Write a protein that binds this DNA or RNA. Structure first.
Ligand SMILES: [Mg+2]
Ligand SMILES: [Mg+2]
Ligand SMILES: [Mg+2]
Ligand SMILES: [Mg+2]
Ligand SMILES: [Mg+2]
Ligand SMILES: [Mg+2]
Ligand SMILES: [Mg+2]
Ligand SMILES: [Mg+2]
Ligand SMILES: [Mg+2]
Ligand SMILES: [Mg+2]
Ligand SMILES: [Mg+2]
Lengths: 68, 52, 180, 261, 150
RNA sequence: AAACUGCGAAUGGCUCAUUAAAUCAGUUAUCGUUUAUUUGAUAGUACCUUACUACAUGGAUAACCGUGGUAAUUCUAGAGCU
RNA sequence: UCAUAAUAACUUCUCGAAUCGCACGGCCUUGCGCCGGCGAUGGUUCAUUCAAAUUUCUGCCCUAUCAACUUUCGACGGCUGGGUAUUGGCCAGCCGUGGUGACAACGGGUAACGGAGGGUUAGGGCUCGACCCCGGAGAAGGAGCCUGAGAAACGGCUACUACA
């Protein structure tokens, strides 16, 4: 056929739009840019791998000098 | 303590008793005028109330 | 057999290497937490009395106070004990610990100075290490600086000057967060 | 089974919630509260599936976060809060009030009510006695407890609650000639007048009612909900809960359809 | 029932919370309130037997002068054994329906109940029993009334 | 950031080995018991302790600086602060 | 012998609030003076909700080349206690000798988790159901236990056996 049906949303203000619209549709419309992140498996491996470190896991090179 | 030094703590602990009272009086007095100035600001809003 | 000597008064610690056994004979058969004289250790230790605080075996197992044995024994360590850190509330895991009687088997002793002597140690008692922070409670500050009930303790508080990395602005001041 | 359950599987939810068998595997699982689990109206289901205000789950919990809508005059902050019979939900911003009440087919329906008279409720008492210190008290069907009641008020009656001060303004006795609505069983939505009551020693008595169309029916005492003696205090929905059979239901749908167009 | 004496055991049997040695003497109609023998009525149109009111027996399992209430289902049966001590066995018979063969067959079950010293029950008597709390491993019923024999 | 403390981790998911009045089904009961959480109501410390301060009590510990042991683990010792 | 009230006492014995943050007001003897509004983390008892454990009645395949079974060291019931969140032969003592069965007990087989239900049709039936819904049990095979309202838990611990 030659007819098409969809859904429409009309917002009162741009701030209410940006405050309520979902991220994936915002990326669809192009108003805001996408977030760059690593894969889910890499994130999961990092999170469970860092559970074996105790205190200030941001830098953990202090135990490299124990061997001399 | 690290922030101060031995001599510093020594004088601070050894400070004369009357000086403590003088410092307290000075602090209470300055607080008194600063509070009075806040009351003067309350008088300024009272003047705004009279204007309105 | 290594030695870890500590000075609580000056807040200083040092590690020494000892290879000659006849100097170390007099520590034997003593218990952890006992009193010993450091005179046989050397001329620089004359007039020194030391307290035995702990030690470690060559294999790495720690000593536990209250168990009398020269070998090591298995125990069911519960929560709140010394050499056990549970992974879950109420968890107990079976471990192996060495008795509290000193013997030739151990690798390192740790001990502290009880009474200062006439002579000085070249690298231990000549330095003092600043305490990182000061008291944080209102009662402690009041008793420490010897104030009275009403003296506006708020003004009297240690202040440390902190600065940013390289922004070029003036440093500011930080305070100990009185909680009472 | 090593404790109580915290999940409810879809395809096992009560039928009167009207949930589609497709589009997901789970159900809202309303949280614990003042109303029974079997016969309750979750707020998320009411707002999203009936009013169609929210498209899906994600914004449903965002909607409540502004505290715009309240029930019984008090704000509730859990999305799966069990609402029930006679409960009134008030939204000040739009300016209308709703009451959760059964229709003639046994499910919850939207029912507009006026703001001025939508500020009171009424509920049946479960037991009456004196509590600690000798103070009498009663508890209704919505977990409302009120101390120092009228001594004439007895069990199984119904009492009118102001909902702002919690004072006993008025009450209705449970006797013949009263107007009642059934709240449990298959006879959902009927309205009738109590004819007579006969009791059986040992529990589980039955009561006989009669509809406006000279119909006759019976139900348990635990399922009767008296709302007045005559001229019922609340506003009944369209149809007045008379349950015409399928013959007249089929006659009326074509009759109004042809009349309109 | 026939009991020679009430106190023929190691311990002393008495009703709990019933004060029996009072300095002041007061006469009251109430059973337990005044200090005399205590009894009540279970209900369901069941009348307290006369032997209970003036009897002296002590029983913690009797529905009368006891701490057991009668509540639940009420059953009927045929008595088959009454020759043990303070316990009876009843037999109940019914008919089961087999759908395929369109006819019935008879079946029966056996039940155990506690008998009070107020009643005297012999073989071939009609009885009515009522549910109660567990009194033993396999005793959950109490006799209430014995119908006259044919 | 880290860490102390609070809560959850007994929900979900998989399988049908054992089990023949055992499990289970429909129908009753708890006047024979326990119950996180949610919701609604609800507590004149009479004197102790004239007084201990009520305009408000008292000691540790984490994180942390720095020094170690074992080839080996989400193993740990002793020293100094809060 | 209920809810509740009253009297004479007791207790290694509880609770009756020394917690935390965002909004800025009123009086007068004008002193760091007094009073005063909404919310997080609690707390004694009652009511409610999610429940849980026990518990009344009836209903399960084939087999007699399975006809009597149960009480050594509880098997049926009575009494006095201990233990459990509570009843109860659940356990400890004393005293009676009981309980089920040809109306199929007891035992042996099951290539047996139970139910809602699937396949096949004049009607009556025969057969399947591990498996999307409800209930029960298990985490290689046995036992024991901490924390916690809730576990005899195994993505919790301890010990043995077999693998590793
Ligand atoms: Mg009843
Ligand atoms: Mg199988
Ligand atoms: Mg509460
Ligand atoms: Mg026989
Ligand atoms: Mg099997
Ligand atoms: Mg199945
Ligand atoms: Mg299942
Ligand atoms: Mg388990
Ligand atoms: Mg296990
Ligand atoms: Mg696993
Ligand atoms: Mg698990």
């Amino acid at each position: 056929g030659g007819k098409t049906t969809g859904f429409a949303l009309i917002y009162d203000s741009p701030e209410a739009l940006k405050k309520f619209e979902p991220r994936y549709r915002l990326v669809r419309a192009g108003l805001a840019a996408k977030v760059e992140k690593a894969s889910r498996q890499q994130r999961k491996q990092r999170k469970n791998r860092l559970k074996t470190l105790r205190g200030t896991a941001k830098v953990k090179g202090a135990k490299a000098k124990k061997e001399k | 303590i690290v922030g101060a030094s031995l001599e510093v703590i020594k004088e601070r602990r050894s400070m004369r008793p009357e000086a403590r009272n003088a410092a307290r009086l000075a602090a209470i007095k300055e607080s008194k005028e600063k509070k009075a100035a806040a009351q003067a600001a309350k008088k300024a809003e009272k003047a705004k109330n009279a204007a309105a | 057999m290594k030695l870890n000597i500590s000075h609580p008064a000056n807040g200083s610690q040092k590690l020494i290497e000892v290879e000659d056994e006849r100097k170390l004979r007099h520590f034997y058969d003593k218990r952890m937490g006992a009193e010993v004289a450091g005179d046989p250790l050397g001329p620089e230790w004359k007039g020194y009395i030391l307290r035995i605080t702990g030690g470690n075996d060559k294999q790495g197992f720690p000593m536990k106070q209250g168990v009398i044995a020269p070998n090591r024994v298995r125990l069911l360590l519960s929560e709140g004990h010394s050499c056990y850190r549970p992974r879950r509330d109420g968890e107990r895991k079976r471990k192996s610990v060495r008795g509290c009687i000193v013997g030739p088997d151990l690798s390192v002793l740790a001990l502290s100075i009880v009474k200062q002597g006439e002579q000085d140690i070249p690298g231990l008692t000549d330095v003092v290490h600043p305490k990182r922070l000061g008291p944080k409670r209102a009662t402690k500050i009041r008793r420490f600086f010897s104030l009275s009930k009403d003296d506006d303790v708020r003004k009297y508080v240690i202040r440390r000057e902190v600065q940013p990395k390289g922004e070029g602005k003036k440093p500011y001041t930080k305070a100990p967060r009185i909680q009472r | 089974a090593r404790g109580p359950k915290k999940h409810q599987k879809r395809l096992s939810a009560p039928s009167h919630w009207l949930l589609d068998k497709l589009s997901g595997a789970y159900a809202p699982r309303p949280s614990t509260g003042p109303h029974k689990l079997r016969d309750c109206m979750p707020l998320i289901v009411f707002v999203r599936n009936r009013l169609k205000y929210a498209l899906n789950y994600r914004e449903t919990k965002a909607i409540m976060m502004q505290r715009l809508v309240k029930v019984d005059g008090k704000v509730r902050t859990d999305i799966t809060y069990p609402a029930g019979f006679m409960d009134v939900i008030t939204i000040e911003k739009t300016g209308e009030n709703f009451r959760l009440i059964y229709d003639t087919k046994g499910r919850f329906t939207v029912h507009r009510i006026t703001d001025e008279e939508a500020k009171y409720k009424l509920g049946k008492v479960k037991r009456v006695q004196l509590g600690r210190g000798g103070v009498p008290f009663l508890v209704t069907h919505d977990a409302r407890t009120i101390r120092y009641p009228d001594p004439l008020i007895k069990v199984n009656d119904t009492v009118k609650i102001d909902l702002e001060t919690g004072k006993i303004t008025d009450f209705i006795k449970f006797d013949t000639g009263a107007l009642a609505m059934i709240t449990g069983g298959r006879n959902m939505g009927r309205v009738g007048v109590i004819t007579h009551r006969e009791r059986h020693d040992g529990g589980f008595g039955i009561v006989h009612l009669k509809d406006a169309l000279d119909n006759t029916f019976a139900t348990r005492e635990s399922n009767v909900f008296v709302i007045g003696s005559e001229k019922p205090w609340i506003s009944l929905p369209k149809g007045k809960g008379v349950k015409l059979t399928i013959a007249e239901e089929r006659d009326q749908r074509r009759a109004r359809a042809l009349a309109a167009a | 029932a026939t009991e020679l004496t009430v106190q023929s055991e190691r311990a002393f049997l008495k009703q709990p919370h019933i004060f029996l040695n009072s300095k002041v003497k007061v006469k009251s109609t109430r059973p337990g309130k005044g200090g005399r023998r205590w009894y009540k009525d279970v209900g369901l149109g069941f009348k307290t037997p006369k032997t209970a009111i003036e009897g002296h027996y002590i029983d913690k399992k009797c529905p009368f002068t006891g701490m057991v209430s009668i509540r639940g289902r009420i059953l009927t049966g045929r008595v088959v054994s009454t020759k043990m001590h303070r316990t009876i066995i009843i037999r109940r018979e019914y008919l089961h329906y087999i759908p395929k063969y369109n006819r019935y067959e008879k079946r029966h079950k056996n039940l155990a109940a506690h008998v009070s010293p107020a009643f005297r029950v012999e073989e071939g008597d009609m009885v009515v029993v009522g549910q109660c709390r567990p009194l033993s491993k396999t005793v959950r019923f109490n006799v209430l009334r014995v119908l006259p024999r044919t």
